[PDB]
């Protein structure tokens, strides 16, 4: 699934981040990040892909030996301290349909504009289905990529749940 | 590597819709349309009255007339008595200790 170039670049990013977790201090990190870059540049032009694969394989074993047992993780990345912290506050938009009319009356302007989005979704749906139908090979899609809208006044197929997803800090 | 031209276009069209949606999450000025030192001393005076004075009245009444009228419901450790003390109940005088040697 990953190409050789993709695997090399992912190792390079991964090794730098673990190197950064060992060094801590910026001047120390900058110094050793340059040595590491030099090692990658030492074989950038290796044309023999059999040798190149072995270099990649050996670099991965070297990384496994020298990885930080407790590397730095950005707080909201998977495994971070703030990961998924705000999922409890994310409420799907369809819940507003079940509001009592008295609750809806407190935001007359918000719910007026909400009807314009629901109307837009209703009048776009048939085109989106028919566009996907006529752009999909006989044996169904071969990838998960979706197409853009082709005409003016058309919306890209399957847009609602991307466009109206909850905000990252919804409360 | 990089977005294909079809990928760029779809991303652009979704970001335009997404930004329009996020703008529409802003409340208008009238929303929500809702239906129909001396201060400090008074706030803390009313708080102490309703949260300290009233409960202590209830608890004291409850303890004095309902709990302490039953046997062994409230049991104090008896007071310590030291040499040279005077007992209130009887007027007894507790004798002092022997003479301490020296140190």
């Amino acid at each position: 699934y990953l190409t050789h170039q993709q695997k090399v670049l992912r190792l390079y990013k991964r090794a730098l981040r673990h190197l950064e977790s060992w060094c801590i201090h910026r001047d120390k990190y900058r110094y050793f990040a340059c040595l590491l870059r030099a090692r990658f540049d030492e074989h950038k032009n290796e044309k023999d892909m059999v040798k190149a694969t072995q270099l990649l394989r050996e670099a991965e074993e070297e990384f496994w030996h020298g990885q930080h047992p407790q590397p730095y993780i950005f707080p909201e990345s998977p495994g971070g301290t703030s990961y998924e912290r705000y999922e409890c506050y994310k409420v799907p938009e369809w819940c507003l349909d079940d509001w009592h009319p008295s609750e809806k009356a407190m935001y007359p302007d918000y719910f007026a504009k909400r009807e314009q989005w629901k109307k837009l979704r209703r009048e776009s749906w048939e085109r989106e289905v028919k566009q996907l139908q006529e752009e999909t090979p006989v044996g169904g899609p071969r990838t998960e990529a979706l197409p853009p809208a082709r005409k003016q006044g058309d919306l890209p197929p399957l847009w609602w749940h991307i466009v109206t997803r909850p905000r990252e800090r919804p409360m | 590597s990089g977005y294909t031209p079809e990928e760029k276009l779809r991303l652009q069209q979704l970001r335009e819709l997404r930004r329009r949606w996020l703008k529409d999450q802003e409340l208008s000025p009238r929303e929500p349309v809702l239906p129909p030192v001396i201060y400090k001393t008074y706030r803390h005076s009313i708080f102490a009255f309703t949260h300290v004075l009233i409960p202590v009245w209830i608890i004291h009444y409850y303890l004095k007339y309902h709990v302490t009228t039953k046997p062994y419901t409230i049991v104090e450790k008896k007071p310590r008595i030291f040499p040279g003390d005077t007992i209130l109940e009887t007027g007894e005088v507790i004798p002092p200790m022997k003479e301490f040697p020296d140190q």
């Binding site: 409420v91 509001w99 008295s102 935001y107 | 999450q25 802003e26 409340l27």
Partner: peptide, 12 residues
């Protein structure tokens, strides 16, 4: 600026 907070109905 104030943003609408999407919540489940609390009325019931």
């Amino acid at each position: 600026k104030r943003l609408f907070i999407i919540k489940p109905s609390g009325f019931y």
